[PDB]
Design a protein around this ligand. Structure first.
Ligand SMILES: O=c1ccn([C@@H]2O[C@H](COP(=O)(O)OP(=O)(O)O)[C@@H](O)[C@H]2O)c(=O)[nH]1
Ligand SMILES: [Mn+2]
Length: 287
């Protein structure tokens, strides 16, 4: 029965949004007491999971760097299981893992369109939750592979449902967010609505919550298909609709998923994860 103020002090970061109107914390560098949390979670003997997909040349371009950096920086001090989904196991980089890390690899079907590779993750993650992850971990993160951990990404990020503020939009007004705006899409969010723009590169929660996130997003994806529409930002559009309806119980600041193309402004104090430069001419095979 951890209490928010046990570990979270919004006053340490007075110039950024630290609490939502539904009283979920927005976790910024300086606001969290990791020691308090490491002790608490170690006493419950938690395990944390991490899913990552790499299909096609995303394997060679990003998977090693992702996993090497995750080994070093993700939930250090707690058992972690990396679940790696690839279309060709023969190209899996098999790095050395450190204390309290282990992994397993699964072969998946490569979808033809990169858009569908990205969106089908929703289906696949749920399948894996039901079959095994629910029995293996207390919390799970689902992440894009095209990014690199830069510093500690620890238990301060854990919660029932966890969303990532997207780096380019965190100070914007909702009517500037790139939600899907066509009412024919299941991902539709009208003008005048919206809390934040969440990044689909990182989301998480307990296995139960992540099952519901992924299942509801995939239902939307499938519905759109039947209506011959494809959301503007694919699974991210659906994820944003989900989290509008089912508010996240924790949000991570853009420090947890930063685009250095923006530079490094005052609000980004310690970067925990950075985007890789895009290489679509090589890693994608369709428009
Ligand atoms: O050809 C594909 C396209 C997507 N992905 C996976 O789906 C994620 C989402 O796609 P992407 O990162 O390209 O989207 P962006 O962040 O560039 O919008 C990637 O990080 C990979 O984990 C992949 O493995 N191969
Ligand atoms: Mn990405």
């Amino acid at each position: 029965k951890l209490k928010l103020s046990d570990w979270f002090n919004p006053f340490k970061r007075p110039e950024v949004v630290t609490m939502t109107k539904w009283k979920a914390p927005v976790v910024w560098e300086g606001t969290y007491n990791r020691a308090v949390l490491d002790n608490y979670y170690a006493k419950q003997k938690i395990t944390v999971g991490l899913t990552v997909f790499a299909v096609g040349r995303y394997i060679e371009h990003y998977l090693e760097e992702f996993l090497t950096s995750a080994n070093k920086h993700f939930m250090v001090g707690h058992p972690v299981i990396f679940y790696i989904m690839v279309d060709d196991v023969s190209r899996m980089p098999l790095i050395e893992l450190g204390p309290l890390r282990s992994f397993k690899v699964f072969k998946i079907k490569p979808e033809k369109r990169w858009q569908d590779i990205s969106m089908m993750r929703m289906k696949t993650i749920g399948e894996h939750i039901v079959a095994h992850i629910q029995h293996e971990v207390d919390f799970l993160f689902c992440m894009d592979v095209d990014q690199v951990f830069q510093d500690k990404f620890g238990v301060e990020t854990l919660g029932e449902s966890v969303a990532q503020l997207q780096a380019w939009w965190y100070k914007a007004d909702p009517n500037d967010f790139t939600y899907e705006r066509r009412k024919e899409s299941a991902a539709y969010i009208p003008f005048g609505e919206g809390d934040f723009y969440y990044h689909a590169a990182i989301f998480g929660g307990t296995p139960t919550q992540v099952l519901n996130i992924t299942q509801e997003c995939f239902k939307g994806i499938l519905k759109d298909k039947k209506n011959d529409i494809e959301a503007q930002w694919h699974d991210e559009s659906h994820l944003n609709k989900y989290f509008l309806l089912n508010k996240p119980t924790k949000i991570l600041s853009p420090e947890y998923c930063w685009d250095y193309h923006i530079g490094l402004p005052a609000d980004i104090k310690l970067v925990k994860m950075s985007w890789q430069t895009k290489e679509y001419n090589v890693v994608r095979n369709n428009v």
